[PDB]
Design a protein around this ligand. Structure first.
Ligand code: HEM
Ligand SMILES: *[C@@H]1O[C@H](CO)[C@@H](O[C@@H]2O[C@H](CO)[C@@H](O)[C@H](O)[C@H]2NC(C)=O)[C@H](O)[C@H]1NC(C)=O
Ligand SMILES: OC[C@H]1O[C@@H](O)[C@@H](O)[C@@H](O)[C@@H]1O
Ligand SMILES: [Ca+2]
Ligand SMILES: [Ca+2]
Ligand SMILES: [Mg+2]
Length: 336
């Protein structure tokens, strides 16, 4: 053990700098420990930084990307021009400055900001935090980030190459429970992907399985499907993964228990946090990560819809008993 310069007790002196980074992030980047756009942007960033990793390219003698190396910041000049990386510039520059000021690697910083940001959203599990990733990195090869217009086969092959099973793909998607879109249909800027964009809950899994009946915007944007109610945006990839036979049963099992969702997500994130590195080479500073307030609401089928309005796609398993709310159909406000 060690007692940091500010009284904070911790398990390794390497963790001490992280207490200052936490105070900076919570005060400035997160504007007072809030769960708003910055957390959502950072979650996009962690996935896009880490997923630039490909054992297949490497086995073939090409550079496959360094994974969770902070390349998205170090080489943003290249990576931020990738089609899937739009609307990230400002967040990346904000993060670039904190890492430079505290002398922490861009790779560790992205993982830390992710774990910290999630602590600001009720319902979130406490993400593991390892430190020690080298600050050096090479730009990620292009075409390694799954897109919303991709087929399930395509998404699974790419993610499978990175090292994730179909189950883990569904688990990692719990992040869309704290999501909106700004670039798929700018006419409905920040339309959320679930009714609770500030609560890490199973609503996303439930709501994407409902029959699509509504066009929330003036028109249908890129990769946009009909959603279940006004204000909610539904992206094609999500609607497809919810219904595909390879992923439908896992998606269905995520509807009933926030606890189980959180456990699986934490596990898949721990795995994604070290793509490109050896975990037994890093230092564990999980003790620095704050806890999120608990979510006590029960998973519900909102606004009068019933299991009848759910497009049950898992045959082997019956759809769980969930609480039903009374009507009318809600109309979602833009995510903050
Ligand atoms: C199967 C792959 C996935 C695809 C195809 C996908 C696609 C997208 C797209 C197109 C957007 C809309 C962004 C915009 O237009 O502003 C978005 C939002 C988001 N994605 Fe994903 N995503 C996937 C997996 C993930 C994963 C694994 C994470 C993180 C762990 C994640 C976290 C987020 C978050 C939090 C947002 C919200 C951004 C905001 O509200 O500003 N996504 N995603
Ligand atoms: C991590 O690497 C980056 C570059 O990859 C370093 O960033 C540069 O830092 C200098 C000051 O040290 C700035 O004037 C440059 O603008 C930065 N460049 C970029 C692309 O951001 C960073 O300082 C390194 N950090 C550590 C702790 O080694
Ligand atoms: O309060 C406004 C909300 O009402 C609902 C729909 O009209 C949404 O498109 C909108 O966000
Ligand atoms: Ca990367
Ligand atoms: Ca939610
Ligand atoms: Mg009905």
């Amino acid at each position: 053990s060690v007692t940091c310069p500010g009284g904070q007790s911790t398990s390794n002196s390497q963790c001490c700098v992280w207490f200052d980074v936490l105070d900076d992030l919570q005060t400035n980047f997160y504007q007072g420990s809030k769960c708003e756009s910055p957390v959502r942007k950072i979650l996009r960033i962690v996935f896009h930084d880490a997923i630039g990793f490909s054992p297949a390219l490497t086995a073939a003698g090409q550079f496959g990307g360094g994974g969770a190396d902070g390349s998205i910041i170090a080489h943003s000049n290249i990576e931020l021009a990738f089609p899937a990386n739009g609307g990230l510039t400002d967040t990346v520059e904000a993060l670039r400055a904190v890492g430079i000021n505290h002398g922490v690697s861009f790779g560790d910083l992205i993982q830390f900001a992710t774990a910290v940001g999630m602590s600001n959203c009720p319902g979130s599990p406490r993400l593991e935090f390892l430190t020690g990733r080298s600050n050096s990195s090479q730009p990620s090869p292009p075409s390694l980030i799954p897109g919303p217009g991709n087929t399930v086969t395509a998404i699974l092959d790419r993610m499978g190459d990175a090292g994730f099973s179909p189950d883990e793909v569904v688990d990692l998607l719990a992040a869309h429970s704290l999501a909106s879109q700004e670039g798929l249909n700018s006419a409905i800027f920040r339309s959320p992907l679930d009714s609770t964009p500030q609560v890490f809950d199973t609503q996303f899994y439930i709501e994407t399985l409902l029959k699509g009946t509504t066009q929330p915007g003036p028109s249908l944007g890129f990769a946009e499907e009909l959603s279940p109610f006004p204000g909610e945006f539904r992206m094609r990839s999500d609607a497809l993964l919810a219904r595909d036979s390879r992923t439908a049963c896992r998606w269905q099992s995520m509807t009933s228990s926030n606890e189980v969702m959180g456990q699986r997500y934490r596990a898949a994130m721990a795995k994604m946090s070290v793509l490109g590195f050896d975990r037994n080479a890093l230092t564990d500073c999980s003790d620095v990560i704050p806890s999120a307030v608990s979510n006590n609401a029960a998973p519900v089928i909102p606004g009068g819809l019933t299991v009848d309005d759910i497009e049950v796609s898992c045959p082997s398993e019956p759809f769980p008993e969930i609480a039903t709310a009374s009507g009318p159909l809600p109309s979602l406000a833009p995510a903050p």
